[PDB]
Design a protein around this ligand. Structure first.
Ligand SMILES: NCCC[C@H](N)CC(=O)NCCC[C@H](N)CC(=O)NCCC[C@H](N)CC(=O)N[C@@H]1[C@H](O)[C@@H](OC(N)=O)[C@@H](CO)O[C@H]1NC1=N[C@@H]2C(=O)NC[C@@H](O)[C@H]2N1
Lengths: 82, 207, 130, 79, 155, 122
RNA sequence: UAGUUGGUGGGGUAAAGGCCUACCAAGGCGACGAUCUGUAGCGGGUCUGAGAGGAUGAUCCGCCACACUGGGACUGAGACAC
RNA sequence: CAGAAUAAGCACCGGCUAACUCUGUGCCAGCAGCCGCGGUAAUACAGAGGGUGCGAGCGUUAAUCGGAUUUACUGGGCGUAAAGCGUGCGUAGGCGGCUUAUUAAGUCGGAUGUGAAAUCCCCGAGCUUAACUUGGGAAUUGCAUUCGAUACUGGUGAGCUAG
């Protein structure tokens, strides 16, 4: 089914995740439908830690996408921050 | 790597003082072989030189003054050419913005080699952190200071005493009492000595 | 046979200038008349006349000389029947950094390259003049 | 909102089918001289209206046979 | 007047009993602010050949109208089988040219230019072609005067 | 050529041939010394040049030059050959790497040792 | 090139279609290169070059194909299935 | 915390190309990318001294583009350097005189959609700096649809006489 999950980028021991909407059967870092934000667990200084597009997130959730547990937690955090 | 060896023969080959020694005694009295090349086949400065020889000998002088090797110097040239403005001015600003050069021009190091030794041994703090890289570029407004453990060192007092004799540079504002200075802005080409013909290095690398 | 009358006109003008003639005449057509008018407006020639005696019509151009040299130092056909050249508004050629003129046929008439750039249109590049 | 083409009929022998020859003028990719290119399309003619030499319009449709995927719309000019 | 020595060559002439050798020198002189010239000299010794070449170069001079320290417009020129192309450049470019072109351009006072040789690279012919191109290069004032327009009209 | 001729027939490009075909685009090749002998140079040179005939893994049978002074090669030795022309020995287009497989490094040298494969004396 | 090109009746498929079959017609492709033959996974890209071009298709991403060599089907939403 | 204590090699010096002498050998031994060195004073072979260029690397071989305007579209040639068929006629094709009306295929302009991400470039951000990672842009010079323009080329109709 359609899921919203994290795709791992960045470098060794400093991961940087893209939040993507994709078919669950695709490879983790491969084909995806839409990119709707990013997550940087080790951000510091002026670096932005989390960015999520709430409009597209809600649109895909209404269309039937299933967020992963981490993405759901990040969406809750973003809603709390905003 | 890093060049270790005799300093004065480099000055003799280049034909000019390269500030490699501290400067307690003049270069002429220090070497007694100035005006001659370091080789057994060495001649005076009046010998004929090709354009390639002139271009090469100009770049080597700057490299020997600043202690920079060929790969890092080429990277500096590429960065200067990428950045808009006079390429030679950008290259000289890049050389003067190095942390080890800035410490030497602050006067905590009697020689750029001594300043580099201090920076490597973490005797100097940039902003508020103990860095150990000599090639770190110093930006406008940065604050350079001496670590407390490194304070009270006879080499540092000797270096600041010699820096008092040397001309204090305009672009750096340094208090010697607490041993701390501020980099205000990049030096200008007019502020820099005029014996350097950076255009020769430019034509060398542009080929 | 004769298959490029514009090139014939340019060649006649060039040879007359090289031979120091004051006047050059040829069979006339509306395209050559338009090109001659553009040259006169740009100042490369003095006067353009058309004599219509009968079904035949003759075009006459008065040439200009300045300090012992012809005003037109270079005239070159660019588009030819064997290879036509069309350019957009962003690729119109510049003749020796704007000191010359490229004659361009556009949907709004025959004009110079800078006029075509100002009007924001392209067309067929007929000739380079300098 | 359908893709149409205009061409000349060069064959009408087979049942309910015509062969239309389309022509286009393009620039050579390297030498820049405009050249002529031609493609042959099989169309469907339900009533065999079209004839050899006419100028016809055809439009894209679902496949009708192995080689036919275009249908005749009208005869612009008759031979 | 800066003086540059483009080339020195040894030439031979055959007589009974052996060969007579001589030297030829090609020189370019220039003020560096729009005046340049070139010449050749032949003598049995290099100093005399160079002196004759310099004297001929001083007798053969022209005046060049530069746009600042660069060319007014791109130039194509040729002398015999040597063809040269020169093009204006922006500040900081320098003189990107071979030795023979470089002598003439530096003597004439060009500081930024991109240049190229096609065909033969014989020094005398290359110098001839560059010299002719520099002589024949024009300026907006001359163009406006010859067309009867104004400089702003010429654009 | 006219534009129409260029459209009808293009511009042909002549392919180039490798000067070292026995290597088959490899940097080096293994071989077995079929012969070890000596040849004479062409004019105006005169010397006694040391050459070997080697059968390569590529399938070719070529001749290679032995550089330096003094070599231990004999027939049935296993050697490594690289590119390089002598230009005074006709038909010799390859060199033998000193010190690789059975070739020994040249002795009594202390300058340019990396060529000829001489280790650093203590 | 003789299911070959088109048409009709029928079959068949999730679905258009000579995909299959029985009849009818003689059609269809080709110097704008058919047929045959050599080589080759394709693209985003990479290297070089002032540019135009030339060379290339590791590592990353998309598509395709294959699974000791050939021919098949079953189950299943989906395979002719490492 | 203890102690300078554990840490420097490789190629080259005839010209192209920065860096020169002495011994040994005498067309031998050998060097060599090209031109070329060696036959008793070898700056070109081998060693040494000195120097030059790089530096945890330094050289060689292989391979691609460049220099090569040396397949020339940009951007070459054919009297004698390589290059005009022995000469005509003619098929396909390429190109084609002047005026006028019309068409809008070529040509030009606008709008919309698309041209995945990564990569290249620019301004920032985080790595002690840099490599590297990353935000946003710019770019993707293309394709398609639709609406316009009519000078030139093409199509169609009419007319003309310099071919
Ligand atoms: N050659 C010997 C001929 C012997 C022959 N058997 C004689 C014969 O049989 N019958 C006699 C018939 C003679 C004929 N009708 C007249 C004639 O020849 N016209 C043409 C020659 C013009 C004039 N005469 C020579 C001339 O002006 N030279 C100058 C000169 O050298 C020099 O400038 C000065 N100022 O010194 C140089 C710049 O440095 O520019 C040259 N100019 C050029 N260089 C360029 C180049 O090569 N190509 C293209 C173009 O750009 C050229 N222009």
């Amino acid at each position: 089914m359609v899921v919203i999950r994290l795709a791992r980028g960045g470098a060794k021991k400093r991961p940087f995740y893209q939040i993507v909407v994709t078919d669950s059967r695709n490879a983790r870092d491969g084909r995806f439908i839409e990119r709707i934000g990013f997550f940087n667990p080790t951000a510091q200084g002026q670096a932005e830690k989390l960015r999520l597009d709430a409009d597209r997130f809600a649109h895909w959730v209404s269309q039937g996408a299933q967020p992963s547990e981490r993405v759901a937690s990040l969406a809750a955090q973003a809603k709390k921050a905003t | 790597a890093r060049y270790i060896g005799p300093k004065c023969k480099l000055s003799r080959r280049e034909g000019t003082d390269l500030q490699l020694k501290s400067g307690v005694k003049p270069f002429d009295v220090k070497t007694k072989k100035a005006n001659k090349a370091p080789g057994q086949h060495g001649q005076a400065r009046g010998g004929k030189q090709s354009e390639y020889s002139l271009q090469l000998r100009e770049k080597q002088k700057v490299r020997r003054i600043y202690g920079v090797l060929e790969r890092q110097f080429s990277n500096y040239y590429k960065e200067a050419a990428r950045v808009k403005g006079a390429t030679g001015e950008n290259l000289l600003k890049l050389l003067e913005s190095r942390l080890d050069n800035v410490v030497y021009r602050m006067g905590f190091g009697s020689t750029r080699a001594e300043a580099r030794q201090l920076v490597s041994h973490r005797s100097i703090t940039l902003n508020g952190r103990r860095v150990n890289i000599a090639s770190i570029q110093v930006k406008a407004g940065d604050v350079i200071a001496v670590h407390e453990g490194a304070k009270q060192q006879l080499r540092i007092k000797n270096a600041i005493e010699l820096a008092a004799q040397r001309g204090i540079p305009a672009w750096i504002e340094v208090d010697h009492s607490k041993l701390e200075g501020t980099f205000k802005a990049a030096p200008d080409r007019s502020d820099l000595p005029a014996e350097i013909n950076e255009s020769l290095i430019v034509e060398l690398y542009s080929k | 046979s004769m298959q490029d009358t514009v090139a014939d006109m340019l060649t006649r003008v060039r040879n007359a200038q090289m031979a120091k003639k004051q006047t050059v005449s040829m069979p006339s057509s509306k395209l050559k008349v338009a090109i001659a008018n553009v040259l006169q407006q740009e100042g490369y020639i003095s006067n353009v006349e058309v004599a219509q005696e009968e079904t035949k019509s003759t075009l006459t151009i008065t040439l200009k000389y300045f300090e012992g040299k012809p005003v037109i130092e270079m005239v070159k056909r660019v588009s030819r029947p064997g290879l036509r050249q069309y350019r957009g508004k962003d690729k119109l050629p510049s003749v020796k950094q704007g000191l010359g003129i490229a004659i361009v046929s556009t949907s709004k008439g025959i004009m110079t390259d800078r006029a075509a750039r100002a009007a924001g249109i392209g067309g067929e590049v007929i000739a380079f003049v300098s | 909102t359908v893709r149409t083409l205009t061409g000349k009929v060069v064959s009408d022998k087979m049942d309910k089918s015509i062969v239309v020859l389309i022509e286009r003028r393009v620039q050579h990719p390297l030498y820049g001289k405009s050249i002529r290119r031609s493609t042959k399309l099989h169309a469907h003619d339900e009533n065999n209206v079209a004839k050899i030499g006419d100028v016809v319009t055809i439009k894209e449709s679902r496949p009708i046979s192995k080689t036919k995927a275009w249908t005749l719309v009208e005869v612009v000019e008759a031979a | 007047l800066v003086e540059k020595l483009v080339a020195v060559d040894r030439v031979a002439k055959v007589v009974k009993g052996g060969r007579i050798f001589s030297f030829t020198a090609l020189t370019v002189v220039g003020d560096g602010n729009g005046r340049v010239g070139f010449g050749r000299g032949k003598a049995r010794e290099v100093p005399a050949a160079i002196s004759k070449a310099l004297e001929a170069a001083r007798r053969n001079m022209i005046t060049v109208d530069l746009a600042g320290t660069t060319l007014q417009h791109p130039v194509n020129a040729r002398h015999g089988a040597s063809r040269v192309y020169m093009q204006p450049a922006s500040e900081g470019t320098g003189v990107i040219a071979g030795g023979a072109m470089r002598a003439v351009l530096e003597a004439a006072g060009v500081h930024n230019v991109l240049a190229k040789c096609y065909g033969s690279t014989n020094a005398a012919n290359v110098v001839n072609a560059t010299f002719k191109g520099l002589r024949d290069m024009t300026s907006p004032e001359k163009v406006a005067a010859k067309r009867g327009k104004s400089v702003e009209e010429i654009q | 050529a006219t534009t129409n001729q260029l459209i009808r027939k293009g511009r042909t490009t002549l392919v180039e041939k490798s000067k070292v075909p026995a290597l088959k685009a490899c940097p080096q090749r293994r071989g077995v010394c079929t012969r070890v002998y000596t040849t004479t140079p062409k004019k105006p040179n005169s010397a006694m040049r040391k050459v070997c005939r080697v059968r390569l893994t590529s399938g070719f049978e070529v001749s290679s030059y032995i550089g330096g002074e003094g070599h231990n090669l004999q027939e049935h030795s296993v050697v490594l050959i690289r590119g390089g022309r002598v230009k005074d020995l006709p038909g010799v287009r390859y060199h033998t790497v000193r010190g690789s497989l059975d070739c020994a490094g040249v002795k009594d040298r202390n300058q340019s040792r990396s060529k000829y494969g001489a280790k650093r004396p203590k």
